[PDB]
Amino acid sequence: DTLCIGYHANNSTDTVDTVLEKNVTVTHSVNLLEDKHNGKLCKLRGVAPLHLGKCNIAGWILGNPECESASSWSYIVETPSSDNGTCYPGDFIDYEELREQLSSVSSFERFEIFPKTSSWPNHDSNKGVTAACPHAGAKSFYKNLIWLVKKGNSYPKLSKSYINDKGKEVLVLWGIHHPSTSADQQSLYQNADTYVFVCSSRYSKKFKPEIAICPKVRDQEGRMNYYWTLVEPGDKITFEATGNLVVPRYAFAMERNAGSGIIISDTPVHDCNTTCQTPKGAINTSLPFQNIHPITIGKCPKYVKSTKLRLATGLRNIPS
Amino acid sequence: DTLCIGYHANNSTDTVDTVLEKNVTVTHSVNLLEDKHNGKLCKLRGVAPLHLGKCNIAGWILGNPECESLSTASSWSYIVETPSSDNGTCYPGDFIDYEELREQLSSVSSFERFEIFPKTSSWPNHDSNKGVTAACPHAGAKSFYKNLIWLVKKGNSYPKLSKSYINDKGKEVLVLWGIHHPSTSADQQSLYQNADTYVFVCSSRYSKKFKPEIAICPKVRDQEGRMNYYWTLVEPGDKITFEATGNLVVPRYAFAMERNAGSGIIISDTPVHDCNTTCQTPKGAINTSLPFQNIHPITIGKCPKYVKSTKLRLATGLRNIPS
Amino acid sequence: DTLCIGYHANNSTDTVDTVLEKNVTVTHSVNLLEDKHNGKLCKLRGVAPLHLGKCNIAGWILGNPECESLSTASSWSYIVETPSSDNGTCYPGDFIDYEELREQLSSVSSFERFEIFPKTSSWPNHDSNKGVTAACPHAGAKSFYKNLIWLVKKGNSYPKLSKSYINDKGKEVLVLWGIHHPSTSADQQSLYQNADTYVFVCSSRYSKKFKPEIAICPKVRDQEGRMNYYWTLVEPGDKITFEATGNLVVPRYAFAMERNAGSGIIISDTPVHDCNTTCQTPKGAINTSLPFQNIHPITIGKCPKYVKSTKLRLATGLRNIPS
Amino acid sequence: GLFGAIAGFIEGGWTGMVDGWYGYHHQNEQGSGYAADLKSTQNAIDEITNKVNSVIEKMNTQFTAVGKEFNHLEKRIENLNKKVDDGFLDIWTYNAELLVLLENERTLDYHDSNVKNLYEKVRSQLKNNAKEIGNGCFEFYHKCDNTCMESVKNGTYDYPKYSEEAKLNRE
Amino acid sequence: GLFGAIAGFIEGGWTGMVDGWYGYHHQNEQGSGYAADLKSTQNAIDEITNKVNSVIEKMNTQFTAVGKEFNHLEKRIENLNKKVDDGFLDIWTYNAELLVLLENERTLDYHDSNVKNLYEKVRSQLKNNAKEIGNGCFEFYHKCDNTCMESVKNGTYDYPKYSEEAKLNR
Amino acid sequence: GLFGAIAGFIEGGWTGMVDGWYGYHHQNEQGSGYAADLKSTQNAIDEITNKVNSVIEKMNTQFTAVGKEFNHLEKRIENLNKKVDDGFLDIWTYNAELLVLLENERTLDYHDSNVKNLYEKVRSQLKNNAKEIGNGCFEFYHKCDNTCMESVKNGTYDYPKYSEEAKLNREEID
Numbered sequence A: 001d002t003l004c005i006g007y008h009a010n011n012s013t014d015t016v017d018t019v020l021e022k023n024v025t026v027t028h029s030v031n032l033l034e035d036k037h038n039g040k041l042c043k044l045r046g047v048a049p050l051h052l053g054k055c056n057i058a059g060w061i062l063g064n065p066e067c068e069s070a071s072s073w074s075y076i077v078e079t080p081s082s083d084n085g086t087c088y089p090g091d092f093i094d095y096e097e098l099r100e101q102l103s104s105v106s107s108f109e110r111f112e113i114f115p116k117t118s119s120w121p122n123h124d125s126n127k128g129v130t131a132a133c134p135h136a137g138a139k140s141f142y143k144n145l146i147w148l149v150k151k152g153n154s155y156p157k158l159s160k161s162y163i164n165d166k167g168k169e170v171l172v173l174w175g176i177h178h179p180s181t182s183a184d185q186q187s188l189y190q191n192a193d194t195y196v197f198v199c200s201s202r203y204s205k206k207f208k209p210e211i212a213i214c215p216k217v218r219d220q221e222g223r224m225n226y227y228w229t230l231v232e233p234g235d236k237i238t239f240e241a242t243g244n245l246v247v248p249r250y251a252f253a254m255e256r257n258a259g260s261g262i263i264i265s266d267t268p269v270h271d272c273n274t275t276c277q278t279p280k281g282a283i284n285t286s287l288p289f290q291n292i293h294p295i296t297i298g299k300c301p302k303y304v305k306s307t308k309l310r311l312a313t314g315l316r317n318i319p320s
Numbered sequence B, C: 001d002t003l004c005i006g007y008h009a010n011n012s013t014d015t016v017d018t019v020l021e022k023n024v025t026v027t028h029s030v031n032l033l034e035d036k037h038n039g040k041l042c043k044l045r046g047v048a049p050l051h052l053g054k055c056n057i058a059g060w061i062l063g064n065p066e067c068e069s070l071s072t073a074s075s076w077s078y079i080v081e082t083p084s085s086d087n088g089t090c091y092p093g094d095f096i097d098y099e100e101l102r103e104q105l106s107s108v109s110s111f112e113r114f115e116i117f118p119k120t121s122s123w124p125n126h127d128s129n130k131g132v133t134a135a136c137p138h139a140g141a142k143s144f145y146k147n148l149i150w151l152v153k154k155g156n157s158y159p160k161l162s163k164s165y166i167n168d169k170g171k172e173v174l175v176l177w178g179i180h181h182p183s184t185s186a187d188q189q190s191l192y193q194n195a196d197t198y199v200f201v202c203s204s205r206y207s208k209k210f211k212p213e214i215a216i217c218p219k220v221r222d223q224e225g226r227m228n229y230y231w232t233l234v235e236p237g238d239k240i241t242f243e244a245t246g247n248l249v250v251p252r253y254a255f256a257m258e259r260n261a262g263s264g265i266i267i268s269d270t271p272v273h274d275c276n277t278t279c280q281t282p283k284g285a286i287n288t289s290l291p292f293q294n295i296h297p298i299t300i301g302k303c304p305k306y307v308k309s310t311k312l313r314l315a316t317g318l319r320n321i322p323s
Numbered sequence D: 001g002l003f004g005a006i007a008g009f010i011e012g013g014w015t016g017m018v019d020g021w022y023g024y025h026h027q028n029e030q031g032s033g034y035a036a037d038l039k040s041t042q043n044a045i046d047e048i049t050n051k052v053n054s055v056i057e058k059m060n061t062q063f064t065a066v067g068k069e070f071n072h073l074e075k076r077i078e079n080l081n082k083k084v085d086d087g088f089l090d091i092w093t094y095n096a097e098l099l100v101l102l103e104n105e106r107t108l109d110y111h112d113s114n115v116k117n118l119y120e121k122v123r124s125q126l127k128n129n130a131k132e133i134g135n136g137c138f139e140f141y142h143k144c145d146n147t148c149m150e151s152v153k154n155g156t157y158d159y160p161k162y163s164e165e166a167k168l169n170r171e
Numbered sequence E: 001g002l003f004g005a006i007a008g009f010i011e012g013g014w015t016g017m018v019d020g021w022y023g024y025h026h027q028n029e030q031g032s033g034y035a036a037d038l039k040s041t042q043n044a045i046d047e048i049t050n051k052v053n054s055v056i057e058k059m060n061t062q063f064t065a066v067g068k069e070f071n072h073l074e075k076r077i078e079n080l081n082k083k084v085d086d087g088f089l090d091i092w093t094y095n096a097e098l099l100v101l102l103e104n105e106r107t108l109d110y111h112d113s114n115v116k117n118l119y120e121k122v123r124s125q126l127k128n129n130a131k132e133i134g135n136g137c138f139e140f141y142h143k144c145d146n147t148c149m150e151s152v153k154n155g156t157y158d159y160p161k162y163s164e165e166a167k168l169n170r
Numbered sequence F: 001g002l003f004g005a006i007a008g009f010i011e012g013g014w015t016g017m018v019d020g021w022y023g024y025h026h027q028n029e030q031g032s033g034y035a036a037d038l039k040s041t042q043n044a045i046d047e048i049t050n051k052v053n054s055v056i057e058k059m060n061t062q063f064t065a066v067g068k069e070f071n072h073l074e075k076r077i078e079n080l081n082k083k084v085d086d087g088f089l090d091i092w093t094y095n096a097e098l099l100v101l102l103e104n105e106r107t108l109d110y111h112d113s114n115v116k117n118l119y120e121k122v123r124s125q126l127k128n129n130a131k132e133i134g135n136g137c138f139e140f141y142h143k144c145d146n147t148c149m150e151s152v153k154n155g156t157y158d159y160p161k162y163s164e165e166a167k168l169n170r171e172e173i174d
């Protein structure tokens, strides 16, 4: 009569590594490394990204004619070929900071801050168009700004204020135009020596035209610089100018959302939820580690450049 | 006759988690998680913090009347502002590179306030009394910062002023100044006469030209005008020169100082106290006997590592089987 | 009659620490801590560093007379300055975005100095010879940066200057210029004739208008005036335009280059040698076999992780007990 | 292995014991077969499960948007940002790999220990009544039907009841 | 668990033994009692203290002011800073949690091992002058008085001294 | 030690045994000598080397220029940078030290385990035919010659073929 003590064996072929030995065959094991993604750009928090298509944030926010663009989004997606941005050449001041701050919002509403109907009685608001910003083959301009110009050989000093009665922050953007020549200066704004001044309770800046013949960009030798600021609720912002001012027409009442970001990718958007987004696709896993992509948005596994993290659960498999 | 081998058991109700099973009762254990503080803001490495009370750094470093400006402390380990430290720039305007100044003043050794341009003798050709405003009230009356002087036209002529200082101290000298921007051309003239003015400031390393920017801005503290604040650090051997035909708010007091590696600024209602620590938290001070800490992520000093854990107790004894 | 089971012992005096007991003598062991270097600055990835000698990056790139502009390599893996590398901007002034430039030149795969605006033909209506100073002395005479030309009026006049360069190089071209600020209106007229001047620079990406800021600033290398330095990278196919009525220190030589990601600047007296390394330290290179090192935290390349350990000895044999 | 049983003096596993992780094989008059030790097996599943859950559930990370955008004049902070991502990369890659290598060795040792403990428990019940015929097998010096076999698998084996008979079979 | 002794073939602990981690219960001609084993208990205390100190003392902490202030136009570096703190937070929380879980397991194994080794040690001295009666108990074949119990404990048991007598009772 | 052999019931090591980590010392009519168990010694070598290599080769590092330069008005990001470098320092230093402490304990435990396993393997073979006289030594109840001795070392000891002789010597001393 005999009694034998022994352990389980099976048809398992799974291998794991130990500090002492590599490629040990065990009866049972579990993977700790997430290496699968769904190839999609999904909703975070149950909220869709803002997808700008062939436009970049500059084109969308200024209202470039090729961009007609929700009241909420969890992050922003641009394509590698999102070229339609600032169609009139010039510097977009603090552009990356603006993009970061528009990356996620809980509330976003465009509104005519300075109604083109009655805002500018002493200036021409119908000539500010350009081949640099075409629409339907004809000269046009940004939808959210107005390129004011003299009427009847006179450009009176302008002074305009807006009081923020939106229960939240207001994003106001404006431009400063710099002619290539003094003839163009006079032709556009009459006055030769001009300024623009913009001030709220926080913000304050004075602008001067910088006239010169610069290299042609989109066939323009002149330039247009773009500026923005966030006006707090209850606060007033004032514009003063004797020329060269591209005035706000549409601004944005908004509620900013913390720490999201921007994805630049051809990956298609889709109606699914994820807790962790990659530019290659979404990741839905309970696993602690991940080797899909270092650049992620959400509550994600940690990125590692491992290709195998297999945890043994069972014992060494010895069928014999 | 028997002899039994065994292990200890006690009344201990302490529990620990092991990778194999949770909530195991053991005979003895110790906590690796610092989860207690003293609710005080303490001297860091023997050196007290600078508590600004109802003032912020701007108000303190400038002469804001509501601020004390002290005085016997030539050194501090960090700075404390209260969540209700509103008194700063009483005349609305921009304080350029303000956060940088705050970081750079967070910890200094030696800190000497001194009248870089004596009020009585410095400005014989300009009026150094009219420069007050309801924006910076003092005891109800119109006043101004203590560390700056707002010069205006004396009689009806603002002569080009030129004033220079050589750092005779054996340390960096922090110099602050302002540029006033009237709301109207009418005010420019009444103030400085000249209408078209400039201000120029330069050392060996620094050089900036200012020009007044006149416009009616929204009223802040009842002021439509503005006043921008600027600063710089003059090296030990260096000289700094000021030149203006108007609109300059001249330094009256500057600051000799030696800056340390760099601490930080705590904004908290926690009281400051006569205690000593090696790790300071906005909630209070903690000991540095344990490697981890869950009091607060934002610390100053040589601190345990902040973790999210609620307990981290390590077994020293064995499984408690009193049965 | 007996058989015994036992374990090896030897003359080893090596100790290791275990979590349970310190200084356990063991029969065999290895060190995981790299604690030695070769006292050399070496080639990184088969490419030598750029050693600037007594010059810093400012002096080298502007072409300060005491710096070598004729034989710099066509590529390098990092840059080395010595702690005393003094020769930089001999004419005083601000060098705008200097740290960024340093960073961006840290490692280059291709680098060609060429004459963007040849001196003999570019400036027929201006004086390209009198632009010298005792601030930048050379072979016993007033001189100036080799890569710039300080244009002055020819005869009694300084006509409007307007000139452009089209980058037909296969790559980015680094262009540097200066803006001169005289200390007096008289120096302004003596130099440029015109009292009220401007400089304008613009490419497709870059645009800036400059205005002389005239004032007597503290003397530096005998200069009360100032000269500010600027730069931009002109992308291939783009144009950069220069326009001025005075005060423009014009580009003469520029640098076609291809930048390599990252890398850095080592500031050390440690000599350069014909050695190849994968990890450089300011005090010498190290081997990347082991996972940890205590030589220096500031390294370049693929390096062991820096630690404050003095020893990480790993037991391999067993406890050594010879008796 | 650490405890010398698995892949040790017990040289192979049993596919015949699909019943569980550890157990016995007996043979006597009333038959023979593979029976898993339910107690020890179950305890191990419970403990190895907690192990796996620990490694996983303990991660619990902060919500983060990793990517950042810097312009052509922000190369320094851009490389500082890369330094942060790369440092985290090196930390997690090294620690994840070592975690698996070390814990895999410990898991194997664990199973080995469980087997050893089982075998030693039997060996200590019988002492003289059986002999150790190697490969983790015990041969009784006396008849041991089911009621006796189940007894040993209960830790309630009656040494005295068989001590006399067992004495004889040692020629 | 891992060494089979604690909660194993010695099913429970002794509340009665109040002066050490591992010890003895004796019961002879002149009374019974619990008595800690000093050599093994003190060694364990020394080794567990070394362990606790190691986990604590190896923690180097650079002087650091964690907090930063960025203005409304520095959101990117503000967020970068956040990623740093949060990054450090996930690394230290995960590693602290696993360290404690893992080492606690080891500490318990450690005690179990100590109890095992102690039982084995006494079993070695006794040889067959006593019987193994289970639950970590030895039954002496000879008359083992106090001075005998003392000598078994302190490892200086005199085998041949009682070898004859014990052999008698069988 | 965890397994109670090294520095335990086997009190000391053998300077005499110079060709291996673990082994045997025999003594009989034909004399005495030290012999290292070559198979278990070699297994331990391979496994320890793999341990050493894993701790080293799992460290793969990114190309990085650690140094950064900030001007006098960039103190905040300079301090952010320093916090990053200091953070990596504190994480790597702590993990390095603890790695070495814990793995050193495991390596010593490992050797101990091997020794104990070698002891049980022999004890298992000898069964009745020998006596355990402590200090890791077995005193045979029969006459064990070089050939006999050898069969124990390589695991081919024939218990039955000595039991009869053993039983008599066994009982006289028992």
Ligand SMILES: CC(=O)N[C@H]1[C@H](O[C@@H]2[C@@H](O)[C@H](O)O[C@H](CO)[C@@H]2O)O[C@H](CO)[C@@H](O[C@@H]2O[C@H](CO[C@]3(C(=O)O)C[C@H](O)[C@@H](NC(C)=O)[C@H]([C@H](O)[C@H](O)CO)O3)[C@H](O)[C@H](O)[C@H]2O)[C@@H]1O
Pocket (backbone or CB within 6 Å): A127, A128, A129, A130, A131, A132, A139, A147, A149, A178, A179, A180, A183, A184, A187, A188, A219, A220, A221, A222, A223
């Ligand atoms: C202000 C203006 O119309 N400038 C054009 C200039 O007109 C001269 C005029 O200023 C002067 O008083 O009299 C002389 C007569 O000798 C000229 O008539 O003439 C230049 C040469 O043709 C033009 O340059 C061309 O501009 C082109 C772009 O035209 C548009 C544009 O599409 O952007 C047409 C728009 O209607 C106009 N917008 C507004 C609001 O007036 C703009 C605008 O002038 C500029 O964008 C402002 O900088 O120009 C191409 O750029 C072409 O390559 C270029 O030669 C001046 O446009």
Ligand SMILES: CC(=O)N[C@H]1[C@H](O[C@@H]2[C@@H](O)[C@H](O)O[C@H](CO)[C@@H]2O)O[C@H](CO)[C@@H](O[C@@H]2O[C@H](CO[C@]3(C(=O)O)C[C@H](O)[C@@H](NC(C)=O)[C@H]([C@H](O)[C@H](O)CO)O3)[C@H](O)[C@H](O)[C@H]2O)[C@@H]1O
Pocket (backbone or CB within 6 Å): C130, C131, C132, C133, C134, C135, C142, C152, C181, C182, C183, C187, C190, C191, C222, C223, C224, C225, C226
């Ligand atoms: C060329 C020269 O020597 N200029 C000096 C100037 O003389 C003027 C003269 O050139 C002109 O024709 O007529 C006017 C009056 O109508 C003057 O007589 O006078 C200034 C006042 O004494 C001098 O200022 C001194 O400059 C010194 C530095 O000398 C250098 C220098 O090495 O930096 C000499 C260089 O030749 C000169 N370079 C050029 C291109 O002109 C520079 C340059 O003027 C300055 O760097 C511009 O900022 O100056 C000392 O700095 C001394 O302290 C100062 O008074 C002119 O040197």
Ligand SMILES: *[C@@H]1O[C@H](CO)[C@@H](O)[C@H](O)[C@H]1NC(C)=O
Pocket (backbone or CB within 6 Å): A043, A045, A046, A271, A272, A273
């Ligand atoms: C995502 O979750 C939200 C609620 O949080 C829900 O409205 C939506 O249906 C979910 N999306 C999908 C595709 O399941």
Ligand SMILES: *[C@@H]1O[C@H](CO)[C@@H](O)[C@H](O)[C@H]1NC(C)=O
Pocket (backbone or CB within 6 Å): B064, B065, B066, B086, B087, B088, B089, B090, B135, B136, B137
């Ligand atoms: C001081 O602070 C109080 C409360 O914020 C404020 O109302 C008052 O105007 C301040 N005084 C000055 C001079 O700043």
Ligand SMILES: *[C@@H]1O[C@H](CO)[C@@H](O)[C@H](O)[C@H]1NC(C)=O
Pocket (backbone or CB within 6 Å): C011, C012
């Ligand atoms: C130990 O033995 C080796 C081998 O002969 C010998 O070379 C060496 O001198 C000894 N070790 C030391 C450090 O003395």
Ligand SMILES: *[C@@H]1O[C@H](CO)[C@@H](O)[C@H](O)[C@H]1NC(C)=O
Pocket (backbone or CB within 6 Å): C045, C046, C047, C276, C277, C278
């Ligand atoms: C120097 O060695 C490194 C790797 O260690 C390699 O990248 C480099 O190519 C070597 N030098 C050359 C020019 O081969």
Ligand SMILES: *[C@@H]1O[C@H](CO)[C@@H](O)[C@H](O)[C@H]1NC(C)=O
Pocket (backbone or CB within 6 Å): C064, C065, C066, C086, C087, C088, C089, C090, C135, C136, C137
């Ligand atoms: C070079 O540096 C030395 C100081 O080391 C200085 O005296 C000399 O003037 C410098 N030359 C130039 C042209 O910068």
